[PDB]
Amino acid sequence: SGFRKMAFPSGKVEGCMVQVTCGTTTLNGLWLDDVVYCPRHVICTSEDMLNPNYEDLLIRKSNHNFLVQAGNVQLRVIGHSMQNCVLKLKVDTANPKTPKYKFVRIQPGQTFSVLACYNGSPSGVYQCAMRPNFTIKGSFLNGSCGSVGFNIDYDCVSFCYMHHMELPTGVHAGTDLEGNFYGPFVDRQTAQAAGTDTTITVNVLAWLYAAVINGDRWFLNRFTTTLNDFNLVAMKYNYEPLTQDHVDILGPLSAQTGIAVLDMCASLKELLQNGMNGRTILGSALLEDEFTPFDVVRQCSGVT
Amino acid sequence: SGFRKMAFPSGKVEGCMVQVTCGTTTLNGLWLDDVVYCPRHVICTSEDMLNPNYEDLLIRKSNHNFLVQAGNVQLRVIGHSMQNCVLKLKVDTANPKTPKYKFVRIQPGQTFSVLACYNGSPSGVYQCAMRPNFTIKGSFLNGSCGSVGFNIDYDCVSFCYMHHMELPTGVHAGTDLEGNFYGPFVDRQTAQAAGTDTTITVNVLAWLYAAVINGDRWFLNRFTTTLNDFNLVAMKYNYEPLTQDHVDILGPLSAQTGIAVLDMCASLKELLQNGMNGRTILGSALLEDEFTPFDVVRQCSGVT
Ligand SMILES: O=C(Nc1c[n+]([O-])cc2ccccc12)[C@@H]1CCOc2ccc(Cl)cc21
Numbered sequence: 001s002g003f004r005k006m007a008f009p010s011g012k013v014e015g016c017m018v019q020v021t022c023g024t025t026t027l028n029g030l031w032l033d034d035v036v037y038c039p040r041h042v043i044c045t046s047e048d049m050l051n052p053n054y055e056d057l058l059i060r061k062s063n064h065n066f067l068v069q070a071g072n073v074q075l076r077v078i079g080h081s082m083q084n085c086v087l088k089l090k091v092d093t094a095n096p097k098t099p100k101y102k103f104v105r106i107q108p109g110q111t112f113s114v115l116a117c118y119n120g121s122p123s124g125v126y127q128c129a130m131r132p133n134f135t136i137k138g139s140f141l142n143g144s145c146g147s148v149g150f151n152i153d154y155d156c157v158s159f160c161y162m163h164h165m166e167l168p169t170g171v172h173a174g175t176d177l178e179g180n181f182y183g184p185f186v187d188r189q190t191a192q193a194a195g196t197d198t199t200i201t202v203n204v205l206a207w208l209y210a211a212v213i214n215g216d217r218w219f220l221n222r223f224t225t226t227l228n229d230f231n232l233v234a235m236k237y238n239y240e241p242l243t244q245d246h247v248d249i250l251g252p253l254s255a256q257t258g259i260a261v262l263d264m265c266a267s268l269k270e271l272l273q274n275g276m277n278g279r280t281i282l283g284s285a286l287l288e289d290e291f292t293p294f295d296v297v298r299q300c301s302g303v304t
Numbered sequence: 305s306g307f308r309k310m311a312f313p314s315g316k317v318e319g320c321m322v323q324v325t326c327g328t329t330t331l332n333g334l335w336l337d338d339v340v341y342c343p344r345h346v347i348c349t350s351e352d353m354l355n356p357n358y359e360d361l362l363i364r365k366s367n368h369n370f371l372v373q374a375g376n377v378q379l380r381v382i383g384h385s386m387q388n389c390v391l392k393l394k395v396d397t398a399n400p401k402t403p404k405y406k407f408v409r410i411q412p413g414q415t416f417s418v419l420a421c422y423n424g425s426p427s428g429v430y431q432c433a434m435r436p437n438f439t440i441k442g443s444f445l446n447g448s449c450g451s452v453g454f455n456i457d458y459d460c461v462s463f464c465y466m467h468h469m470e471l472p473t474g475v476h477a478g479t480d481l482e483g484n485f486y487g488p489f490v491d492r493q494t495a496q497a498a499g500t501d502t503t504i505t506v507n508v509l510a511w512l513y514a515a516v517i518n519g520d521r522w523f524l525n526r527f528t529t530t531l532n533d534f535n536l537v538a539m540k541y542n543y544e545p546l547t548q549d550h551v552d553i554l555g556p557l558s559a560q561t562g563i564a565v566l567d568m569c570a571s572l573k574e575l576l577q578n579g580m581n582g583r584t585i586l587g588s589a590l591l592e593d594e595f596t597p598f599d600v601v602r603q604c605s606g607v608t
Pocket residue numbers: 041049140141142143144145164165166167172186187188189190305
């Protein structure tokens with residue numbers, strides 16, 4: 001019982017974090033096998049960030065200009081290449097702590113853990129979601145660039161995010177591990193505004209199912225709805241449209257609780273229209289949308 | 305920028321988790337040096353839990369009746385003793401991954417990370433606080449007993465909690481690493497009710513300071529108050545009384561923001577009296593109390 005915003009155990013990713021310095025810029029790198037991945041803006045000064053031409057700035061950099069430090073020991077850089085917005089620094093030593101891993105590009109609404117680091121050292125771990133506007137709401141300070149987002153399936157770490165920047169609104173933007181930004185963001189110090197941060201409907205529904213499993217049932221109404229009727233209300237409240245794929249994905253939670261997905265949609269529709277009235281659901285006064293149906297199942301079943 | 309409920313990196317504690325089985329009961333153990341710490345109810349059957357006499361049940365147990373497995377390898381148990389509500393199983397092998405550590409008994413209002421485990425395997429990490437009624441609001445299922453709570457100061461892990469039980473209300477109870485329960489709870493399957501779960505005032509104030517640092521300033525009022533006037537309102541709202549020690553502890557946040565502690569108390573007093581009016585502070589529709597002043601400073605400064 002109880003329901004928490006839970007992050008994956010971070011040990012497997014802590015064993016991959018290194019410090020990358022190029023000139024006077026220091027950030028974090030991810031060391032997997034004999035390659036260190038890091039944001040390509042490690043080659044930029046603060047002035048360069050205003051309008052960087054990365055291919056040009058990279059011409060002035062050699063292997064020896066990238067200082068990679070794992071713990072308090074220096075790694076020898078024997079190659080470097082730019083792939084989209086990340087640099088891959090080939091080192092002469094394979095990371096002995098390299099876990100089984102994959103690089104995945106997640107979809108909006110998917111959650112992941114972030115191991116926030118400074119100077120290649122982990123400071124904390126938190127859970128977040130890729131927002132429908134492709135930003136994330138993280139917690140990152142100067143030096144946190146290169147911190148990664150990941151999910152773990154038993155012993156395989158799927159890295160899905162690498163932190164690159166903060167927008168003027170305090171929201172965050174980054175890339176997958178192939179260097180492609182999520183959303184339309186670019187690694188330049190220029191005004192970039194985020195789109196509408198809509199609520200991940202399927203995630204709210206999953207968390208209402210978690211609430212029912214953990215005993216918070218006050219919001220269960222006597223109504224049902226259809227996907228079309230629900231979606232009319234959802235659009236009005238800046239909630240993402242719910243599809244039959246989302247209903248399918250919620251099937252295991254529907255079965256566990258005996259509450260049909262569309263009945264839970266009707267309860268959510270009434271919560272949107274009536275508000276919480278000062279009440280809480282799982283200790284929250286707002287509808288939480290950063291638990292996927294998979295996270296709810298995993299947390300409520302005990303997957304390790 | 306951004307402010308998250310952040311847990312400590314869990315790697316150092318993941319390297320200590322083992323599975324402890326006694327007969328047909330399996331839970332988690334913490335392996336530090338050549339000792340495995342676990343809840344003493346590992347010796348009980350479900351029937352025994354109703355009214356256990358631990359000293360008597362322990363007479364029927366020998367070293368070979370405690371099965372300790374670290375990963376998929378069995379540890380040899382060469383001694384066992386009960387200290388309060390924990391069993392200490394002396395093993396013949398010192399844990400090679402033993403980090404620098406301390407056992408601390410925390411005070412109500414103090415936060416810590418929990419590495420939730422099942423069968424000695426980590427499933428997730430979350431942050432919580434020792435409530436003023438000495439319960440915690442965790443996320444624990446069958447088999448999670450023996451999961452620990454901890455804080456990290458650079459490279460030293462201070463273990464402060466070991467999970468033992470869930471109360472009928474879905475809140476959690478456990479001990480420090482010397483086996484002493486927090487609060488008045490006993491390791492028996494008997495009706496035990498929690499006291500008032502008051503709000504940790506000093507923590508709410510710290511989180512309002514974090515909100516100001518991260519740009520959420522709408523709630524800043526034009527008022528000030530005194531500790532006595534504030535505390536009259538705080539008692540009425542089931543908030544813990546604020547002391548001059550709490551004001552001292554908030555001094556660094558007051559200095560960072562230029563907002564005097566008593567002015568922030570007046571803003572909190574108005575939030576209590578007026579409510580949020582549908583607004584949010586750091587993405588929350590309620591006043592968060594599970595960030596200590598130290599956590600706010602650490603997260604806003606980047607301590608690794
Ligand atoms: O965004 C950047 N830094 C930081 C990132 N984050 O997330 C938080 C921070 C806080 C406090 C100072 C720095 C921070 C750098 C700094 C300059 O502007 C850009 C523009 C594009 C790119 Cl890809 C990175 C950057």
